[PDB]
Symmetry: D2
Subunit: 386 residues, 4 copies
């Protein structure tokens, strides 16, 4: 009955089930969880692995000794459970020093500190077996127009990413980078606010092959965009290195609900696309159990993330395998969208009278697309009402 | 008193002052304007030139004879007034045949027709002296998930743009292309919905040098994004080939108000950036005088577009030239944002103890950025309250 | 298999299935439908009745003779099919005369014309057996601040509604009024933009008992509000006289998709509330089949509206009847929300030491609400995955 | 040069200049300010008074002794500076006990505690001379549909407000209540989400005369609504008891920028309306100096709030006094909007052939409203470019 197993590749950040519930208007409602405990509880629920920011695992300001101790305990829990660590990232947003950014702070000294903190964590990530290193520039941006010259900030962001690429290359590490966009919050506007802006920026780096995107459901939805469409563009470009799954109810603060909550039809189309395209990376959940819940509610919320993905996978698979759907797809000319417009070439197109001089515009215009019937088949499959 | 002249490079689409006022819920409130009349009236107000879609100038379905007649009359009005035609574009959205798109319609025959209609208008544009050809794919998109496989639609959109590039190259034309993004309306979601998504797509075309963006104030604002920030990224990439200026009041239907209306502080920061970066293309207005107005109100609205740009230019120039502002910019470390983070190189950074081991995080964190004082100077300059 | 019957009280506006597909950027894609044909087709699909604006039934400018002829033909189709007409409304938005509003136009003569056109249609509505008369003030509003003094416009809107109430009372008609809010489109901002603003305005009319609201799913969603919450406030006030069902994908132009499309979880909670509260009015659909469709697609879209309501009704009923859900509701203290806070009275509350002096705040704070488990039960029921 | 004085009635919450800078993603960047220090600094800048939540003045959990000490120190600073305390409110959102709400928590015991905490602070407010007591129900709402039955929650919210009214009446206090709406954040959806919903709810209380609204600029803007329009409806109803002034950049998290930031044209129209209507309550600022600033930046931000109001007041006054504007207002028929539609009565309207039978619809439709010229005069006045 929709039971996950390590083979489904479900992963969770330590900061997700570990969120204590502090919000802009309130104090924590839950005590802090030890990372060893989260690993054990997640393994029992059927997850494949966990991810972390540097500061989730090693308290900021830790001595070298304390650091070694925290890592050793964590590595023991991984060995005991069989859990993996497929991705890691850096906290460049909590401490007051990062109030104006990490890579793009106006103060040069802060920029140099941000790169050193990042490099230290790349070494750790490699040691633990991570394949992807994410960067979410949550403090890179502004609340007012004069505060940041965006051209100079993009020069600084390029310079930081180029140096990180030089580092991994020189060390011979087998790790790639993934930038995670977000349009706003905590800054008034954040730089590289969507998947499109991040894809475009990557093409100006020195070694573009090392970088991809880590899109998050709720972030593109904070800009009112279609998440499955943005993911299709990232797959088309060959840059979907990792993904963050959650839920969001429209354009407002970043809710981070469990996956399946928020826009349920967009979750269906997302799973349809990931499974059809054969995405083989982790199915990672960046969510926050609501502050109304106790620990029992934390684990129920985490289990619901995986359950919802498995129900949707079943429904999308049933939709694509139904002969009546296959027929409707041809009725709506999805097979013709996949054929080249003009494999014959430009000259042939130019000489083809059927393409212009003798094209019957009225006959073509009268042809219904039959999209509503197709979408009702998709609705019936989602609801299990076939 | 803020009087424009042809030297200010102000341009208008024929469809702007010529909008009859038909909306989703109502009939036209104004009669149609002859293109010759719009040219004469615009020249008297101090504009530099006009732009057009194919169907604005030559009624759809026109015979070759009728076509020649419409062009001749238009060329006479240009000669009489000294007006130029710096940009042209194609209508691939009004006629029912384009109900599912032009370049990405599911029907292959429609796709071939869309390319032939486009090519015919490129020839005309060159004849009239246009330097930029815009493409706004208003019907490229969907209302439901199953209707369009986005990967196949991006293959089709790439194929269309590649063929157009082959055409201009083979003909030896001196024209470049600019894609205009929009997130939604008239389709539920439109492909390449923002400046970022369009920049990323260009990098996958066969001859990327021929293509840039034509961003529009109100379109990025329909996604709640910061317009000046998106323009700074387009300038950074060297792709701001043209721009569409107007106003919009937040996330809702595309209003196309006159420039200066809507978000007035964003208009200030936009003019600040265009003038500082030395953008030298046309200052084009894609706006609609509200359907409440008669002809007198049409021309008042058009004149207000240019007046508002000139007032803002004066205020931004006064802001940048004020010694007290120059001092505040240094107080907020804008001069340090423009210096390289690590011109010393990676190894030097790695060996620098002042960047990590001996960096005083608390001292750096306590430093105020003094952004509020700077933003109040910007406010006083905008309001002429210095 | 989810087959509707006249007993389900499904109704449709003539303008819904009859929308020809003209949008802000394109021409009609379908021919006009005769009202007699729509009545027959709807009856075959299992609808209960239709609704109309004056201008949908009688072409604007019709002579008295032509008017009588249009009504007679329509009454014959109703008799032939058994369809009813439970609601009617007035078109005060299409004709250019209403460009600045009907009831709140700045020109006094237009205001008087708007009331006379309305009164003429109230008489017709009564003749046809309508019980509710809707008013949607789509042109009441503004694009700029100085154009409308809102206090004076609310005086004018009150004056119009008071006169209509005096008319129905003097004639002894058994009809009530329902105001339909919308936040924007076609005006920049519309007056009484949400269900809350309309409820508040009704309390200032001379005979408040005659007026209620006609909320529409997609309109409250254009303001990013929770539709089921707004409907619960209208039911609490005893003012839900009628409802408009459809779908909308967030904050953008008014899409009017078929019911069930858009926010599917909000559609579930809406049906849950209407059926639990025992709403007994019409289940009316104000939707537009997309312009991509031919006539076959029109009727498929209309049938999907009713199918989706019946699937959701089944799922909501199964949720409320499940013993495991009833248990979860008590676990989350929904039974305690329904009990009075202080039936004991103010003095007793003041004297109760358990309410303050001896209240254990920490013990109460530690209690989880168990909302995530309850919401996952709701998800499983919606998806038929119990 | 736009210097405020106590006569301008500017007020600030202790929590505004006192915000330490903790956000959903970061730690505090400033130390806590003693309330006595804020009073002194505000008085030097020209403010009239301050406001507070219970917990801003008396740390939660304080003994009776500690409480008396905190009040005495505060009363001394008021005496020393001449500052007044025109409004007070209750914190029913920070402590974990309020995680599901105060007045509408599902647990009955929490509801009774919320009322007792409120009553204790009403007594204090009266002692300090407050005339208005605000209620912002920031935790009243939900993240999921099943968690809260909205009808029962509105019964509970009515019961709480009725008990508070009984309390003030029985004590003979001269204080009125003002409810402050907000659409979301920190809850997924908050009950009474806009000014309209709060106005409608007041009409169902036992003694409606005791309650009004406290609207906040940025909250209505989080729903994409027009703030000046909502304020005009509150003034029309006679319910604008207090106001919260700040700035917000569209639909996103609640920014609380300084007044004048965000939507500058909406700030102009707001000041125009408050001064024309003769609003005589406090001009209160609920804002947060950005976490990028040190203490110097805090006071600069606070001073900019008052400066911006005074510049806008001057510009709005100049607009209304300009003979050319007075002429444009008549050209746009603002004088006719203020005249009754039908002071002649219903029968006279019914018998008036000029209102329908002989009304020339085409002539009336051709009349331009001349709104664009009027809005450009408003723009020139705002910018000081007359
Ligand atoms: Mn997020
Ligand atoms: Mn994330
Ligand atoms: Mn536009
Ligand atoms: Mn444009
Ligand atoms: Mn609608
Ligand atoms: Mn409707
Ligand atoms: Mn706020
Ligand atoms: Mn407030």
């Amino acid at each position: 009955n929709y039971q996950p197993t390590p083979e489904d590749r479900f992963t969770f950040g330590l900061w997700t089930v570990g969120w204590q519930g502090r919000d802009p208007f309130g104090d924590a409602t839950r005590r802090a969880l030890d990372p060893v405990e989260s690993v054990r509880r997640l393994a029992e629920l059927g997850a494949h692995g966990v991810t972390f920011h540097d500061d989730d695992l090693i308290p900021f300001g830790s001595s070298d000794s304390e650091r070694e101790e925290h890592v050793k305990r964590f590595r023991q829990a991984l060995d005991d459970t069989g859990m993996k660590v497929p991705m890691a990232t850096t906290n460049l947003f909590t401490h007051p020093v990062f109030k104006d950014g990490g890579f793009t702070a106006n103060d040069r000294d802060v920029r140099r500190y941000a790169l050193r903190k990042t490099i230290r964590n790349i070494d750790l990530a490699v040691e633990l077996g991570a394949e992807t290193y994410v960067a979410w520039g949550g403090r890179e941006g502004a609340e007012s127009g004069g505060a940041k010259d965006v051209r100079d900030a993009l020069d600084r962001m390029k310079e930081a990413f180029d140096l990180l690429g030089e580092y991994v290359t020189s060390q011979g590490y087998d790790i790639r980078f993934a930038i995670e966009p977000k349009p706003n919050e905590p800054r008034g506007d954040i730089l590289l606010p969507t998947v499109g802006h991040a894809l475009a920026f990557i093409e100006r780096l020195e070694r573009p092959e090392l970088y991809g995107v880590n899109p998050e459901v709720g972030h593109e939805q904070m800009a009112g965009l279609n998440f499955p469409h943005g993911i299709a563009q990232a797959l088309w470009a060959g840059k979907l290195f990792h993904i963050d799954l959650n839920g969001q109810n429209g354009i407002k603060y970043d809710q981070d609900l469990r996956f399946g909550a928020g826009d349920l039809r967009a979750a269906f189309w997302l799973v349809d696309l990931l499974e059809s395209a054969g995405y083989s990376g982790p199915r990672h959940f960046d969510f926050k159990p609501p502050r109304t819940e106790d620990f029992d509610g934390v684990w129920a919320s985490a289990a619901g993330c995986m359950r919802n993905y498995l129900i949707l996978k079943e429904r999308a698979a049933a939709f694509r395998a139904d002969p009546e759907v296959q027929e409707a797809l041809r009725a709506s000319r999805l097979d013709e969208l996949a054929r080249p417009t003009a494999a014959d070439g430009l000259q042939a197109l130019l000489d083809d009278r059927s393409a212009f001089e003798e094209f019957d515009v009225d006959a073509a215009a009268a042809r219904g697309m039959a999209f509503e019937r197709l979408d009702q088949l998709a609705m019936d499959h989602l609801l299990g009402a076939r």
